[PDB]
Structures are given as structure tokens and as C-alpha cells.
Amino acid sequence: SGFRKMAFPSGKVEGCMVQVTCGTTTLNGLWLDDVVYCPRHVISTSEDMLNPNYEDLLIRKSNHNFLVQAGNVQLRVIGHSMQNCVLKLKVDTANPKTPKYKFVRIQPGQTFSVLACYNGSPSGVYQCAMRPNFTIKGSFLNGSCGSVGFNIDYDCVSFCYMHHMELPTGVHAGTDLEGNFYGPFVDRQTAQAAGTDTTITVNVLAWLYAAVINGDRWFLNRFTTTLNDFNLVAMKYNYEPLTQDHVDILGPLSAQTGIAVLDMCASLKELLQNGMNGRTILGSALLEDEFTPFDVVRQCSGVTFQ
Amino acid sequence: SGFRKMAFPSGKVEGCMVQVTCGTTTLNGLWLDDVVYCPRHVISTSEDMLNPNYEDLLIRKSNHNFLVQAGNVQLRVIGHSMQNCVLKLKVDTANPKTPKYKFVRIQPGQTFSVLACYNGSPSGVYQCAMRPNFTIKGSFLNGSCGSVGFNIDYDCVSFCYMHHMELPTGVHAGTDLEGNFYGPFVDRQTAQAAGTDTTITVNVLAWLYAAVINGDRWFLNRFTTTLNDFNLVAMKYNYEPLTQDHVDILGPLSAQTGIAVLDMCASLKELLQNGMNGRTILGSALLEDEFTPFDVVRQCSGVTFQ
């Protein structure tokens, strides 16, 4: 029983974390088969231009200008490349602890586990979600650049995020490991807007189903309605519109305890006009929106990763 | 920048998790140098859970009885003993993944990270705390016994918990690695409700400081309160008594933020009677008591002006 905010076991990712230094800038890097992946802004943030020119900053650099350190033993760089935001340092030594991995880009509403690293040493692991404004509300300090977010599929660390910079709002932005930034962001230091953040309704519905799996119903009432009878309600309460594809993926959770996904929406509506404040909703008062339907199944079924 | 419920990297613990099977019961085990630590009750039988005589059952079992698997490879047991609640299984193969470790018994209110495992493979990692009633609020399904809780100090895993049972109220009970339960619990079939969960005051005070170092200062403290009269209101609100030792550990956060320990106590009273009315302390509407002062300093490492 119980329901916590779980994160994936980070063991397979801890063995890939190295330290990348170019000049005086030092951040983290991901050591896959024989390539080290790190944000490209390790090559130009020592002279503090506020607008680095990464196209010409890399041509001058040679292989010996970089310094990849795998904890203790130094790594030889035998080639460098840049894929639109990230630096690929070709290394001579293949990482023996490379797991099965794949690069995948996530959509807003998806969740992943972040491994905060400093100087190549992992410090903590936490689970977060990709907000609709293409930002993440994580916990990063200076020197955490290069930290990655990931999921696991039976052995397969699907990397989906790499931390690049922090927005003035306090939220954090980054790219996928192909390089493309999540949202309209640039790796330069110019001030950029965070965007409009909306609570994820599809994750809220899944979270409410997790309460009735371990068992706390406490709100199921008031005249089950249809899809469009809740989209306009979400507009007023800052929540995002609910699509039918969200209902489609809410099937298994509805096909376990509840009657229909439509029934869950009606009870959620009263949770907006009214507040609990006397009995927590299985973890707290405020509604949590960082639990995808796929995360609830994983935690309630005890899925492991070998 | 940012504050989240992070857990320690579970990489070093995953390398110590094995699967222990005793005839018909299967749970997890902690594979240290040449001893596999798993909860006793693995040798017990469903028909004999009324009042198991573990000493009598341990004699009936031999080394060939215990089936220890480190993934796909079997470990041969060459001895079996019992530290009154755990089953030390002497094995022939020394674990090469053993990190520097030590068995520590934590006090109520201290936090640790839990690596939930099933059939010897990890499922997820999350952060929780030992509640004052000597129970934890975790997420465990059947077969999670043997999952351990731990902390890391820069090179060393401090094992402090091993999961044994789930109480009927939804909370979980376990032992230290030396085989001693936290609280009035035994591995039998008696009721064991464990009673009256209490809120941790030293942790919530630290959590209130975390909001200060992240852009939340609207819980202004006007007056102050001494050590005793603070406990006058902390007995009816069901809060852990605050001691001068708790003030000493809160010293570094008091100096870093400039708010005195006694001053912050008076700030809590405004949030109690008046409620929220839309007030969210940086992460939720309710108070969080699973952040020790050490966790706050660890995560948002500020500076102290003196």
C-alpha cells in the first residue's frame, strides 16, 4: 500500500557521468559508448560575452583543449562535434558501464527522473514533469549543467533531457540529447520568458485514480458528465483543456476501480469549487499533476528494471 | 535554485540487492561482503504466523534451503545465523560491488532514501522519514520485504532500515540492519496499529526556512516565543516538542537566513488558525515535515554573513 513520488533507480546513469572541462568552465557530461555528451556552452562561458558564437568557438578548439575526467582516470578526446546545442567529445576509451539506451524527446506532461550531478559526481535523484511551458521545476545549483533526465524500459535508459540554463523565474530549461531545446529557448544568456504554465489535467485524473487504488475515495459524487462539460471549467481554474486522447490513456485506470473516465472528471470538478483542507487527498491537500497514467501503473504494480 | 524531495543516488545500493527464496517465500536481500542480510520471516509459513518460533524454524532449515540469486547467477549458502530479526546468510562468493558501508540506527524525525525492490531487482527510489510513532509512510507492495533505506556521506552508504511489514493503517514498519524493530513491533500476527502519528516540528521549521531561501517571506514573524510556551500550543496541535538540541541543529539555518529559531516558531501560529485562504508555501498548501535541517542546507546551500 501507499503511494510516493518515486524516481527510477539511477544506478545505470551514475556510471555514465563524467566531468568535462574546457578552459575554466567545468560541468557534467554523459559518457555513452565512446562519446561524451554535454551542453555546448562549456566552450564560451569563460569570457562572458552574453551572446557566444558557438559556430566559430568550436572551430578553433582542438581535442586537447578539452579535459574529460571519469572520476579519477582522464579520458583522451579524439574528436569533437556539435549537434545544434550539445557537444559530442569522441573519446578513445569505451565506457564499460554503458547500459542499453536511446534518445527520445518527450512532450509536455511527460515525467522523468533527474540525476543532479556536480563535478561529475551524482548528488541526488528526483522525479519531475515537463511543464506545458516547456520548462521543468527542478532543484539545480551552479555546476549542475550536464545533468540528464531519463526513463527505463526493462533495461533501457531512455535519456530525454539535459540541463543547460536556469530561467529568471527560477524554473530550469534544457535540451534533448539530440540538441533541440525544449521550447523557444536559446543557450545564450539573454533574458527569456518562462511562458504560461497550466496544471496537467490528464496527470491529475491519474493521480486521483491512485487514491482509489490503495483506497481513499472521499469525493466520488455529483452527476458524471461528458468530455466537453469540463473543458470550459478548466479554463477558469487555470487547468489545461482535457482531450479525448487523455481519456483514451485513462482507460486502464478507469477499467480497474472506477466506472468510466467521465465519472472521474465530475468528481474533479467539485474539487475545484470546494477544498478538502481537513483530509488530505492521499498525500496532501493541493492536487498533484506530475503523475502520468503510466507512472501510476508502474508504482501500483511493482514494475522492476533489470 | 529550486527545492524538491530528492533522494540519494541508489547506484551503490542496487549492486547489493539480491533475491532470497526459502521454500515458498521470496523477498529481497542485501548482499554485503560475504553475508546476505534479509528479514527473518522468510523461513516462516503462512500456517505458522500466529506465533512463529524462529529459533525452532531456523534449526529445521539448512544452507541448501535458502536460494539466493544475484540476477541470473545463484549464490551458494555456506552458513545461516540470526540477529533476532534478520537472517545472515553466509555465502561463498564475495560481492565485488560492496561499497563502504555501516549500519546506523536513526532517531525518529530523520529522513532517508528507500530503494523499493521486487524479486531482487529495484523498482524505484524515494525519500521518506521515520515518523515519531516509529513508522514510515512508504510505497510497498507484496514481495518488497528486504528493501532497505539508506543515506550516503560522500563515499559511504549508511544503511538504517529494512522493510518487514505493512500496518493495517497503511503505514509501514521495519527494522535496522542489526535486526531490531523501530517501535513496539514484532514479526507476528497481532494487531499493531501503533497509534497517534505525530507531526515533526524540527523538520517543518527547516522546511519553513527553505521557503525563505527561495522567494517566500510572507509569513512574517511579529512577536517571539520562548521554548516552553511554544510547547504549550504544540501539544494540542499534535506537534513534536522542540528542544534546545533541535535549536542547536537549527543554528546554521538561523544564521544563514538571519531569522532566529524562536522568531520562526511564532511565524507558524499565523498559518495555523487563519488557514491558507490561497497561501501556498512554495510547494503546497499544507506543511511538510519530512525535511531535516541537514536536508535543507544540503539542497539549497546558502552563505552566512557574519
Author numbering:
A (entry chain A), B (entry chain C): 1 to 306
Sentences from the paper on this structure:
The SARS-CoV-2 main protease (Mpro), a cysteine protease with essential functions in viral replication, has been validated as an effective drug target. Mpro is a cysteine protease that contains a catalytic dyad consisting of the nucleophilic cysteine 145 (C145) and histidine 41 (H41). It proteolytically processes the viral polyproteins pp1a and pp1ab at no less than 11 cleavage sites, and thereby also ensures its own release. In this work, we demonstrate that the SARS-CoV-2 Mpro is subject to redox regulation in vitro and contains multiple redox switches including a disulfide-dithiol switch between the catalytic residue C145 and C117, as well as a SONOS switch of residues C22, C44 and K61.
Specifically, an allosteric SONOS bridge consisting of two cysteines (C22, C44) and one lysine (K61) within one protein chain was detected by our mining of the protein data base and independent structural studies of Liu and coworkers. It points either towards the active site and contacts Y54 (“in” conformation) or towards the protein surface (“out” conformation). Variant C44S exhibits the lowest residual activity (16%), while variant C117S is slightly more active (42% residual activity). A full kinetic Michealis-Menten analysis indicates that the reduction in activity of variant C44S is due to a decreased catalytic constant (kcat) rather than impaired substrate binding. Interestingly, variant Y54F, in which the tyrosine that interacts with SONOS residue C44 is replaced, shows a similar catalytic deficiency (19%) as variant C44S suggesting that both residues are required for full catalytic competence of the active site. To define the structural basis of the markedly reduced enzymatic activity in variants C44S and Y54F, we crystallized both variants and compared the atomic structure with the known structure of the wild-type enzyme (X-ray statistics in Supplementary Table 1). This structural analysis reveals in both cases small structural changes mostly confined to the active site, notably of residue H41 that forms the catalytic dyad with C145. The structural changes for K61A are clearly more pronounced than observed for variants C44S (0.89/0.91 Å) and Y54F (0.24 Å), highlighting the structural importance of K61.
